[PDB]
Design a protein around this motif. Sequence first.
Motif, short mmCIF file in Angstrom:
data_model
loop_
_atom_site.label_atom_id
_atom_site.label_comp_id
_atom_site.label_asym_id
_atom_site.label_seq_id
_atom_site.Cartn_x
_atom_site.Cartn_y
_atom_site.Cartn_z
N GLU A 1 -1.87 37.24 5.85
CA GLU A 1 -0.68 36.67 4.99
C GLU A 1 -1.36 36.01 3.73
O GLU A 1 -0.94 34.91 3.42
CB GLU A 1 0.31 35.82 5.75
N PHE A 2 -2.10 36.79 3.13
CA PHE A 2 -2.83 36.51 1.79
C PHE A 2 -1.99 36.13 0.76
O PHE A 2 -2.28 35.38 -0.20
CB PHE A 2 -3.77 37.64 1.58
N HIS B 1 0.52 34.51 0.94
CA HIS B 1 0.94 33.03 1.26
C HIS B 1 -0.16 32.04 1.42
O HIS B 1 -0.19 31.08 1.78
CB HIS B 1 1.88 32.97 2.49
N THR B 2 -1.59 32.76 0.63
CA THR B 2 -2.41 31.42 0.15
C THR B 2 -1.99 30.88 -1.17
O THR B 2 -1.30 31.38 -1.66
CB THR B 2 -3.62 32.23 0.20
N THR B 3 -2.26 29.67 -1.40
CA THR B 3 -1.83 28.88 -2.35
C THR B 3 -3.01 29.17 -3.52
O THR B 3 -4.00 29.04 -3.50
CB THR B 3 -2.15 27.28 -2.16
N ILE B 4 -2.23 29.73 -4.71
CA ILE B 4 -3.07 30.05 -6.01
C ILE B 4 -2.79 28.81 -7.06
O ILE B 4 -3.44 28.54 -7.97
CB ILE B 4 -2.68 31.55 -6.54
N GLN B 5 -1.57 28.12 -6.89
CA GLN B 5 -1.17 27.19 -7.99
C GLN B 5 -0.61 26.03 -7.25
O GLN B 5 0.53 26.06 -6.77
CB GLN B 5 -0.38 27.80 -8.96
N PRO B 6 -1.43 24.92 -6.91
CA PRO B 6 -0.92 23.97 -6.11
C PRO B 6 0.31 23.52 -6.88
O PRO B 6 0.37 23.45 -8.18
CB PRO B 6 -2.27 22.92 -5.86
N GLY B 7 1.38 23.02 -6.17
CA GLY B 7 2.73 22.40 -6.88
C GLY B 7 3.54 23.43 -7.69
O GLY B 7 4.64 23.11 -8.32
N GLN C 1 6.38 27.36 1.51
CA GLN C 1 5.26 26.64 0.66
C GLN C 1 5.64 26.85 -0.46
O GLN C 1 6.47 27.53 -1.32
CB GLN C 1 3.88 27.61 1.19
N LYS C 2 4.89 25.96 -1.64
CA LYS C 2 4.94 26.09 -2.92
C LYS C 2 3.31 26.66 -3.47
O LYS C 2 2.61 26.32 -2.91
CB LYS C 2 4.99 24.77 -3.54
N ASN D 1 -10.78 36.37 -4.76
CA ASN D 1 -10.65 35.71 -3.66
C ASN D 1 -11.05 36.39 -2.11
O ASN D 1 -11.68 35.99 -1.45
CB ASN D 1 -9.37 34.79 -3.29
#
Lengths: 304, 306
Positions: free
Chosen positions: B159-160, B162-168, B176-177, B238
């Motif tokens: 589920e790549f 849904h890795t975070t690339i830009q926190p916030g 998720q954000k 990544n």
Amino acid sequence: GFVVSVKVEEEQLLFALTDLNAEIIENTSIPFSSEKKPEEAIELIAKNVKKMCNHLLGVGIAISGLVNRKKGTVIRSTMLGWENVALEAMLHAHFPDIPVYVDKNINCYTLAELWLGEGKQSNNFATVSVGAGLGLSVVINRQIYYGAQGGAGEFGHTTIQPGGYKCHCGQKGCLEMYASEFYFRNRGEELKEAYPTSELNDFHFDKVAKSARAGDEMATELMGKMGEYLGYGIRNIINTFNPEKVIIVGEGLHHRDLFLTKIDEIASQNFFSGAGFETEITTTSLEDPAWLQGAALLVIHQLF
Amino acid sequence: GFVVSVKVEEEQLLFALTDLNAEIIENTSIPFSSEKKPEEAIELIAKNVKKMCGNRDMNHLLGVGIAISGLVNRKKGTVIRSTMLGWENVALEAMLHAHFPDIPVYVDKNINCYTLAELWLGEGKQSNNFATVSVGAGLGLSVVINRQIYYGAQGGAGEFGHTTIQPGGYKCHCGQKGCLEMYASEFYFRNRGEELKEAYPLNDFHFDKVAKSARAGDEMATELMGKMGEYLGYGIRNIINTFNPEKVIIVGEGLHHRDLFLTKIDEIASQNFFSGAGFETEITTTSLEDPAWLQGAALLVIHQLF
Ligand SMILES: OC[C@H]1O[C@H](OC[C@H]2O[C@H](O)[C@H](O)[C@@H](O)[C@@H]2O)[C@H](O)[C@@H](O)[C@@H]1O
Ligand SMILES: OC[C@H]1O[C@H](OC[C@H]2O[C@H](O)[C@H](O)[C@@H](O)[C@@H]2O)[C@H](O)[C@@H](O)[C@@H]1O
Ligand SMILES: [Cl-]
Ligand SMILES: [Zn+2]
Ligand SMILES: [Zn+2]
């Protein structure tokens, strides 16, 4: 019958003498900056291996960066500024008929987890290290996953903030620039002017944790944010690998009271928990010497 | 003998009839948004499975394979969670067996199905550790380790998107954000395009529509497409630093417009931990085409039957 293991950190070299079950008999730490100084570091290693010792069955070495485990070379450690260092060949000048084995630091720790730790039971788990940098080792079938050429697990150099802090690896915005000790310097230098009465100006993990516990405003901001980014990192590991569990290891756990809760808050909101399936995130029950025990196991498994 | 394969997208259901080499004999697509309508989707699937079979002896239908978004329990054939579809615990295989109680039904994540097609028919046939990344409506990952798809603990690996690339960052459909999918897929065009309206006085943010406007020289669409490619570059960087794959295979419907973003991927993703030491990781586009999602879902059945 004994093995000698070495961990090459950036500011000190660690040594241990173990038996054939990787039980530590003796262990030491030598202060030394290995940064851009491989020849001198390796002479120190040879000197200290000799000091600890005929029935030396091998030497195992844990180190940062891209390693060629077949040739015993350090291809690229940007933590140390080492480029194509013939580590095995150089130690064999000193110890001709003694096997030398090299692997990435966190892979050595993970060998220890497999044999002595909370990776006894599990067949598919991830190990993440917190401290000077951020490391990853993934176990798939009780086997460490090395990828095509042994380089897998440079999770510290995944991008967490595009366009962000310049990393030692040459990239900008690497996770390690936010979710390790490096963040304290990267961000702490920017905050000096806003916090002119902060105690804090040594950005080592211990010093930052000390000040944060003392209630220093800058130190608690640094420690708080670092924990958040570590939480993102662990969430990313979960969503990517769907590990049975995540085991957190490393010297940063001496200050776990200041970030574990933050990690759990963030990382437990992940793709699978949105459906009610939680992933366990736990701290190792092993201690700092397991980096060395793991480097020893590197030799021991080569024997049997 | 034959198999019927299905791909459940967000705005259409795709079907194929397949011989036992996964060669497509028949196909069809029904425009239908299954978004929060699983029961209706199953009736449509049942109808079109029959249609694919045509006048054939239904006794020779060996099974049905289904490619779908999200977390699948591949043993029970349930869709545990697809946030692309808004489905939760849909007992897809059981509902279908109600219509076809005497034939095998298998379910797997869409990009896993595509990767089976790469393994048997494509640029994966000659490799043993490689990563497949899909570009289009969302961002998918499947990693092959020793000629086997890596599923992780419960089949959830990859589920790549849904890795975070830009926190916030942008709120994702997963809750998720800052997910990579919100920047490195079609979703970015809506997310960012809405913010750029005032800066550029394009109203349909589908991949095809934005591509068309970008080629026509629309400033906004050009800006959207370039940045999406940059983010996809970071994503592939990544993947490389994490897995050290032998190669990365880019797949997906987004490749219809590859000339608008593929060079941006290479610029970013070619700067990675190993290329710093002179070891390049090949990043290439698949030679298979869109129908390989369906061929993969057919292989899903075939290579579980035999
Ligand atoms: O997490 C504590 C650990 O940090 C470093 O090792 C982790 C990681 O650091 C960089 O990302 C390298 O590129 C990787 O290859 C390393 O695995 C320190 O080197 C280590 O001594 C410390 O325990
Ligand atoms: O990349 C094209 C592809 O996008 C989606 O599938 C990829 C991915 O989407 C989300 O991240 C889900 O959570 C994952 O499970 C999916 O693998 C579309 O569903 C698919 O139809 C399209 O071809
Ligand atoms: Cl979030
Ligand atoms: Zn880096
Ligand atoms: Zn998401």
